[PDB]
Each structure stands twice: as C-alpha cells, then as structure tokens.
C-alpha cells in the first residue's frame, strides 16, 4: 500500500544526526554491504534500557522523542524504540522494510507475548530476505538471512542457529538459537505476519505499562560490543563473551550510577538516579 501508515516515517528522521551517532561510514545506498554495517554500528552503539518505564514515565515511539533520546542524549531504549528508529533509517536509504513480531522465550516455556520488534529487510542487490534484530540488546550485530539454518553459523563471533518449524494451521514458526551463559538456547520465536507501527504501539503500550510485564519493574540494561555483552538485571551485573564464558558482580544501589554511566553510557538527572537508587523495586 502507500498510506504512510504502512511505512516507517523515514522523512521525519535526521538521517545525518543518526548515521553520525552510530558511526556509519559506508556508501549511502540500499546494498547488503550497507545493511551489514547499519546493523553492526547500531547494535554496538545504542544502549539498551527500560528506565523510563521504571521511573513510572511513558515510552513514546514517535521519531521526535526517539531521536532526542537515542541520538541526542546519553540514553537508550528497548526493542520497539530501537527498531522504530532503525526502520526509519532503513527506509530513508531506500531499503525494503516490513515488520514482524516475535515471542521471547529464552529457554523458558509456555507462550509469552509477541512483543519483540523484528525487521524483515530486502536489499537492492538481490531477492534475499534479511532479518534485522537491532533492539534485542544482544545483537546480532549483523543481519541474518531469513532461511533455514539449523547448523551453527556465526554473526561476528556470536554463534546462532535459525530454525523453521510449523505452528498451528501449518504456519511458519521461526526459532533463532543463541549460544551463551547456559549453553545453546532458544532466544525467541516469530511468524512472518506483516507488522506495522500501529502494531508496535500496542506491543509497546503493553511492555511499558503493564503489571503483567517485567520490564516495568526493575532496571534492565544491556550494552552490546562486538566482543562482549554487558547486562544489568536489578543489582546483578553480567558481562558475557562470544565463547560463552562470563563473570558477574553483585552490586549495591550506591554503585549503580557509576556502572550505568561507564558501562551503559546512560546519563540521568540526579532526581532519577536518586529515584533509581532508592526505588521500591530494590525491596524485591
């Protein structure tokens, strides 16, 4: 269709502020070479955080906010915020962009909400379909092709496995597998149902404002590097490496400010740190 509703408001994006912020430096065309760099720069530049939600504040997905927060401030965002911005840039550069939603599982069971923004991308070189997961917080730092890949492959130095299953009604059910702290594991699952900004707003309104949601409770920060992955899960600080190994640290509230600035490149006003430092969340 052509209604702007089916696209990603690329116009409203300050392409240059953005590309400058993630450190892009390649040719400005819709080539696989560019996509492979866009994904890498973004995933390794932008911090991951749910701080607004923890501070009782709303999370907006309009490009205005997304740009003042992720491009002009020392703040990050989660899946929707990240994917929303990335989609705008992709579109701008002449890429083929269509959305999908996945259900994070991370080894768990049951059926979790489909609230994880994913991007199905097409370049100008050929008909291959690329999946861009730029908002998970742990890469992949390169897009992965949308085709069956049961055998361990590597995006950067991180090991994965793309699996194609069948869900109810003979529908496609994809499963991306990542290797980490607890060995192999299913990160999430997703369908190929066309998704749009309106669908992200629903998903975003749930993830950010629902009690049923963990994201609204305590701090959850990730910072992703090509060779390491930092994670703050409450007062537990984790650093993971591509070979699966890792180490942790049990932090104290007073230690949060520094870790958050140095390790997560997130800067907050005092009232917020103060608020963070003494949030009722710690009691849990």
Of the listed 79, 100, 229, 230, which one is catalytic? 79
Active site residue 133: yes
Cα–Cα distance between 164 and 176 in angstroms, integer? 9
Q: Per-residue DSSP letters for 184-202?
A: EEEEEEE----B-HHHHHH
DSSP 126: -
Q: Looking at the structure, do residues 148 and 201 belong to the same domain, yes or no?
A: no
Its domain, for residue 136, covers 95-196
Domains held by the chain: number: 2
Last residue of a domain, one of 165, 196, 227: 196
Alpha helices (runs of H) in the chain, residue ranges in sequence order: 15-22, 32-45, 51-54, 63-70, 79-92, 197-209, 256-262, 270-277
Q: Looking at the structure, do residues 89 and 100 belong to the same domain, yes or no?
A: no
The dihedral built from the CA positions of residue 135, 141, 147 and 153, taken in this order, carries a sign that is: negative
114 contacts 203 by C-beta, under 8 angstroms? yes
Alpha helices (runs of H) in 134-269, residue ranges in sequence order: 197-209, 256-262
Cα–Cα distance between 1 and 127 in angstroms, integer? 20
Q: Looking at the structure, do residues 68 and 184 belong to the same domain, yes or no?
A: no
Cα–Cα distance between 49 and 229 in angstroms, integer? 14
103 backbone φψ class: left, alpha, beta (φ>0; ψ -120 to 50):
beta
Elucidation method: X-ray
Judged on CB neighbours under 10 Å (0-12, 13-18, 19+), 79 is buried
Last residue of a domain, one of 158, 180, 196: 196
Cα–Cα distance between 241 and 229 in angstroms, integer? 6
Output helix, strand, coil percentages for the chain, rounded to the nearest 5.
30, 30, 40
Of the listed 42, 100, 116, 229, which one is catalytic? 116
Of the listed 132, 133, 229, 230, which one is catalytic? 133
Nearest to 137 by CA among 24, 247, 59, 215: 215
CATH number at residue 64: 3.30.2140.10
Q: Looking at the structure, do residues 219 and 89 belong to the same domain, yes or no?
A: yes
Resolution in A: 2.7
Last residue of a domain, one of 170, 196, 222: 196
Cα–Cα distance between 138 and 140 in angstroms, integer? 6
What residues are paired with 224 via a beta bridge? 229
Active site residue 205: no
Q: Looking at the structure, do residues 99 and 89 belong to the same domain, yes or no?
A: no
217 contacts 210 by C-beta, under 8 angstroms? no
Nearest to 49 by CA among 221, 271, 190: 221
Q: Looking at the structure, do residues 90 and 102 belong to the same domain, yes or no?
A: no
CATH number at residue 140: 2.40.128.150
Active site residue 116: yes
């Amino acid at each position: 269709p052509d209604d702007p509703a089916y696209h990603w408001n690329g116009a409203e994006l300050d392409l240059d502020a953005y590309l400058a912020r993630i450190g892009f430096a390649g040719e400005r065309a819709p080539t696989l070479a560019t996509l492979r760099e866009l994904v890498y720069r973004h995933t390794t530049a932008i911090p991951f955080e749910n701080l607004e939600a923890v501070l009782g504040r709303p999370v907006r997905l309009d490009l205005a906010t997304l740009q003042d927060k992720l491009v002009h401030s020392r703040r990050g965002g989660y899946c929707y915020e990240n994917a929303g911005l990335f989609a705008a840039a992709l579109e701008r550069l002449g890429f083929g962009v269509t959305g999908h939603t996945g259900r994070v599982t991370m080894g768990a069971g049951g059926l979790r909400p489909a609230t994880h923004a994913l991007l199905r991308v097409t370049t100008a070189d050929d008909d291959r379909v690329w999946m861009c997961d730029v908002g998970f917080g742990r890469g992949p730092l390169r897009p992965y092709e949308l085709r069956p890949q049961p055998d361990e492959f590597t995006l950067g130095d991180w090991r994965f496995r793309l699996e194609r299953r069948t869900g109810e009604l003979g529908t496609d059910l994809w499963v991306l597998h990542q290797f980490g702290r607890d060995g192999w594991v299913d990160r999430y699952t997703f369908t190929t149902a066309p998704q749009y900004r309106i669908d992200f707003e629903v998903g975003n309104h749930f993830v950010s404002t629902s009690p049923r949601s963990p994201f609204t409770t305590r701090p959850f920060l990730q910072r992703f590097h090509s060779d390491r992955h930092h994670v703050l899960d409450g007062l537990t600080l984790i650093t993971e490496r591509p070979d699966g190994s890792a180490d942790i640290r049990a932090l104290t509230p007073g230690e949060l400010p520094e870790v958050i600035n140095e390790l997560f490149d997130i800067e907050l006003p005092g009232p917020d740190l103060d608020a963070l430092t003494t949030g009722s969340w710690l009691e849990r």
